[PDB]
Symmetry: C2
Subunit: 377 residues, 2 copies
């Protein structure tokens, strides 16, 4: 049965992602000196201005302004006519610094309550939903061709959205593609459209999926010349859906960026991705979404729920059985199981936290053990 589904992504240099990237840049910087730092670094950015504000508890000494400017310069906003200059914008910080003051550390309780969801599905090579994968892949391609001289008239800010038609569970093809890229005053729109079509759209979208019917809307309102923080406003924790799964799977509140791994909102979501991905790699189901919840000061999750949507290859209680035997889902367990106390986070902040294989939560190392506990199959 036909039905269409859509997912959006934005690039590095879309304002809320600038803010995401700076928080995580500060997180890494601290983690490099003090892996057990507690950070919650929220960032706000607007036409003149980056305000990076937080509570931090750490040994580390880190330079917020230096870190802030470097990150805006990598993204590329480096001149007033772009909208924003990394070397002249204002950086304000308001980070309250605290300096650090049960028998098994693995039994320490959750830092806060929360619900968090992880998903996988055999739709893609990376076990992620196809729409959000392609939406991410279009925006990456844009920053790539921008940065490697190919189409050097394009500026940082860009949004993408791809809408997929499915018959029963099966991708059929791509109904509509939208891509809007900031560009210099040098190029104009007809020529721009050729260029994005040749160099961004056609090398990323599987041709089998694109038809005579694929409605492409490249720069629909025309001229996108000033962008980024100029005339707009970005805050960490806004591209929350993009980060995740483009709306295919669910979400509890929580933002990831600027939070160190004590923060279940981040870690438990990463671990839930890891359980679901290992479940589908083991061929226990085709699609799997799990919800995990916690309560403040309790170590055991208050709930685990696995939804294999009528796609299981073992009955479901037997699936929740091995979810528990193979995975330490306690806050400090998570941290152990995925070795998170490391500066790996700025990379997360742009094109999807998930589906990107070299991250600790993407490895399918528990695959077989799950399979051969699932009876043996």
């Amino acid at each position: 049965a036909k039905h269409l589904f859509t997912s959006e992504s934005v690039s590095e240099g879309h304002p809320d992602k600038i803010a995401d990237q700076i928080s995580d840049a500060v997180l890494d910087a601290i983690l490099e000196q003090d892996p057990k730092a507690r950070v919650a670094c929220e960032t706000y950015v607007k036409t003149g201005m980056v305000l990076v504000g937080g509570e931090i508890t750490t040994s580390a000494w880190v330079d917020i302004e230096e870190i802030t400017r470097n990150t805006v310069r990598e993204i590329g906003y480096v001149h007033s006519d772009m909208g924003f200059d990394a070397n002249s914008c204002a950086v304000l910080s308001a980070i309250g610094k605290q300096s650090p003051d049960r028998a098994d550390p693995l039994e320490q309780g959750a830092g806060d309550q929360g619900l968090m969801f992880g998903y996988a599905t055999n739709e893609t090579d990376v076990l992620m939903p196809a729409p959000i994968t392609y939406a991410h892949r279009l925006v990456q391609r844009q920053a790539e061709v921008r940065k490697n001289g190919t189409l050097p008239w394009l500026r940082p800010d860009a949004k993408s959205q791809v809408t997929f038609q499915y018959d029963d569970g099966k991708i059929v093809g791509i109904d509509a593609v939208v891509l809007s890229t900031q560009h210099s005053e040098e190029i104009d729109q007809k020529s721009l459209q050729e260029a994005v079509m040749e160099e961004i759209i056609k090398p990323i979208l599987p041709a089998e999926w694109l038809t005579s019917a694929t409605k492409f809307f490249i720069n629909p309102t025309g001229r996108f010349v000033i962008g980024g923080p100029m005339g707009d406003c970005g805050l960490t924790g806004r591209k929350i859906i993009v980060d995740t799964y483009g709306g295919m799977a669910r979400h509890g509140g929580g933002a990831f960026s600027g939070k160190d791994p004590s923060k279940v909102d981040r870690s438990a979501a990463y671990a839930a991705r890891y359980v679901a991905k290992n479940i589908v790699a083991a061929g226990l189901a085709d699609r799997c979404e799990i919800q995990v919840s916690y309560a403040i000061g309790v170590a055991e999750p208050t709930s685990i729920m696995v939804e294999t949507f009528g796609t299981e290859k073992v009955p479901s209680e037997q699936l929740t059985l091995l979810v528990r035997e193979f995975f330490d889902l306690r806050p400090y367990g998570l941290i152990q199981m995925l070795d998170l106390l490391h500066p790996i986070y700025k990379e997360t902040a742009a094109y999807g936290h998930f589906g990107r294989e070299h991250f600790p939560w993407e490895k399918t190392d528990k695959a077989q053990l799950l399979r051969d506990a699932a009876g043996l199959k």
Copy 2:
């Protein structure tokens, strides 16, 4: 088949909700003078400090500092020992003001791309999921008993989470309840727990649902005395899931607060709630989630998807049929169909945007017409 599901809510006075409420307070204030104002007002709040920052385009003259202080005073933070004083905190603003510069206005195109989701289900009186309804109802009850002198030792900030067990589609009862409330130094924990149990928990939770087994965790870490912005950080658009449906139904990125109705992220979500709620009130299904998407400069939604999860009482294409005949889903159509150009928004900003009947998107006025177009049934 058993399975547990959880949803979280926070009160007015939880920091990200303070920020939500101030944005919407500014929105209303402008709407009162200029209904066609374009506002996108983002707010950040931290221990000393409220920064309210935006792009606005309007006739209206409005006092941001006055609006900011009044809203913090209604929430109740009015003395340094609470954590934050409305009459002494710093208000900074950075609102760029623009003064206002096709044949059928209903055909004007979408302001941005986006995906947005609406849900309903016959689980509750208000056609909303039971967990997020009760989670909201606990936090309301807290602010209510706080504000009406009953338990006047309690301070603004509070979080709630309720975890529900379901057998097949059917609520069975409440497995765990967590409630953590800020309180004065006057009361201590044993007495506090009685009070929340008597006056907040027991009058809100259906007794039939609570058992010998209901794990209640009231103030699990004990002493919550300073809260709100003190020592923490709130930004608009963070309690995005709470606003919605507690993680039962999906979400595209978008925050609601501080955005005027031109912003599809808000309006289309409100309209999608309205379609799904009218579909279930008409007895066309038991549960209905719809996704709507848009592209910048196009008026027709790029996709509509209806998921009645095997609960339909008419085949599904016939459901999407009447979704289109009964509802103008074009950006300016939405605005017409729900009469949004009015200062009704601050109320939205606290305890759920949905499930609250006196809002334009909650009325089931299209109920019958849907039913008797659905064949006649």
